[model samples]
Target: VVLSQAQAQNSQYALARTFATQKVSLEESVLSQVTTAIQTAQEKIVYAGNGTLSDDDRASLATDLQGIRDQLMNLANSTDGNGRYIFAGYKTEAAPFDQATGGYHGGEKSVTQQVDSARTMVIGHTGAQIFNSITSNAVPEPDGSDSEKNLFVMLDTAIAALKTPVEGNNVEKEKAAAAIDKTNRGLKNSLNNVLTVRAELGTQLSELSTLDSL
Candidate 1:
């Protein structure tokens, strides 16, 4: 009877250890990447927000925004150590964000892992959630209308505006300035979203750390 009881106890301990290890591993490999990506997004917003808009400044800032967009594309397609794309949701084998089209190909399904017998913890968020998610008012443009409030689209629009030649025309310059202003607003919103996600991730990381300690 004692031997049987000891065996049962050992099994229980093993299960607990397994759960703890899983939590730690998920936080380190998956959650850490998410946090890093969000932080990078935050930095990009700051970089884009710098300096007043001018013909030369707008051109330079356009280059900077393009660089930021490229960084974001890489982040959106970031993979884990096993080559699984972390932001791709259930479609881990495929890239989440398209480099050529700047589109999100991943689903909204978050990746979760069995952290305990009774609980499954989400280890990573979908690319759509992190990159393409936003809410904003309808923005009317001279050409038409752009309802998109997401970071990727905003950055692309801003780049296009900056690339358009103003030729020292006041009207064209004003239009470009307006477009950059709109992009900055959208970027601010996106940065806030990233920060919010980072806070939630930080909380989860803390919980995982506590569980690992146990």
Candidate 2:
């Protein structure tokens, strides 16, 4: 009777541990998606620096960028149909931003879950953390002093910059140099920022493995 009662209680712990690990893996998968999207956008933005791109080609690039930017925002609204939002603090697929304000609205930091009697695991990365600030951030100033922190808004600006029509080679280079330079700077921080989060998640996952060993 005593042994059976103890085993039943252990089942609760077993389920909690499984659920916690699943959330960690889910977060890892979401981060991977965000990383790949940013990497693709980064490469394409740099390619915008090509010296001979037609106005049409440049416009196409801007549209593609808009799509990517939209995709990035969508990452923050991440869901698995039902398992609490891993990239979400809001728990809804609604965007964590605004049109006029265009800043993050998914609240802060992350969500946590109790995996065991003494351990609480962070189950999600906040939208604000990933889709917002890192370093001083975007919009090339006289030096990189004053800047924008919202990734979506920053990419939004990049799209606008790329859309500028240029009739001659000189104007085209000027536009490309200006837009691509800003995009390069912004995305450098973004890539590193995303990778930093990836590392943190990996570390947490490692911490989880310690439980397995124990």
Candidate 3:
């Protein structure tokens, strides 16, 4: 009876250790992915915030961002080696972003991979989790309207306004100035959101570290 009890206790200990090791490994992998995603988002938002991009430059920037957004959507819908959509909440098989509509179809579901009985880690955030949550509708003139103004749209509008030629009496110029200012404010908000996310990622890393101790 004593021998059987000792063997059973050993087996349980081994199982617990195995589970911990595997969980920590998974958490570390998730932290690495989250860090990369946050960095990429930060760079894109900062580029859109630059004030030098005007008129033709703004249009060019928009074209550039359109391509980047396509690539980002591709990344967001990508699966890991285990075939899980890294950015698609709980829906591993579904693509979070729709190319035609230029919007996210996935909900704000986050996948919290368990590292231990008492500790957990969020694998990654959906596109809706990061970019969609950041509000950037800074054009106060047109109030009471909901606009999901993102980095791409901000650049696109600025480019459209700049493409118009200012005729006599600086009227067109004044309009262009207003357009640029609105776009700038939007860009500022976008940048601020990105920065905030970067900070949050740092906090997440710390949280994951605490999980490791468990």
Candidate 4:
């Protein structure tokens, strides 16, 4: 069998196209994971906002919320189809958030995808880019308290307060409300960040889809 020059070129072009399509598909899947994580966060925020919940109710809710957080962590650590962590920034091999430390370990760098010869855009955001960037310093820390306050710790504290007995001073109530408010503020900030990033990813997806058509 004899292969013509045109046929050889066509074969090579087809291979390149396949590779590009796979890459783009992976990026889009990561974007989808981020979208799902954002929705889960919103749901947890709604659950947290139920201030009138009784202590037993809060305990039950907390149990469910912890499960949600685990899923959120999994989403934050989600990978492209190639298995690279989407929210890990430069450290694509690292987990986005460390459950033990209750802090983000992912890099600050953003991963960009090139759709065509002349167009490129960031397709992924780091965990720090979303979670750590949110502002929630409303609950003034006790003097000499740790300056860093993570959402997990805040929720844990609130849950513990719920378990404690109610008092005439309403001390537990004040603490619970304050923690919820602070966490809510932080969550709101995170929600805004997710929306912004979603817009960016959507734009990139559109650009890539156009390139696909071309």
Model 4 residue 13 CA deviation in Å: 11
lDDT of 2 by residue, 108-151 (tens): 75777665667777766776677675744433555747555567
Task: Identify the leading candidate in terms of TM-score.
Answer: 2
Off by over 4 Å in 3: 1-62, 75-78, 119-121, 135-149, 159-179
For model 2, the superposed segments whose C-alpha errors exceed 4 Å read 1-14, 90-102, 116-118, 135-144, 168-176
- Residues 1-214 of candidate 4 have per-residue lDDT tens digits of 3568656755555455455455445545654665565466556556756656666776666566566566666766777767877677778886778874458887877766543345455545667765555444333444544433354554455445545544454776787766665555555555565556566656655665565565
lDDT of 3 by residue, 7-125 (tens): 77655644554544443344345534544543453354455445444556545554554555555445546666677665567776777767654466765777565544454556556
Clashes of 1: 0
Judging by TM-score, tell me the better candidate of 2 and 4: 2
Alpha carbon lDDT of residue 85, candidate 3? 63
Ranking of predictions according to TM-score: 2, 1, 4, 3
Quote the lDDT for 182 in model 3. Answer: 62
What is the Cα root-mean-square deviation between model 1 and the actual structure? 5.2
As a whole number from 0 to 100, the lDDT of residue 81 in candidate 4 is 63
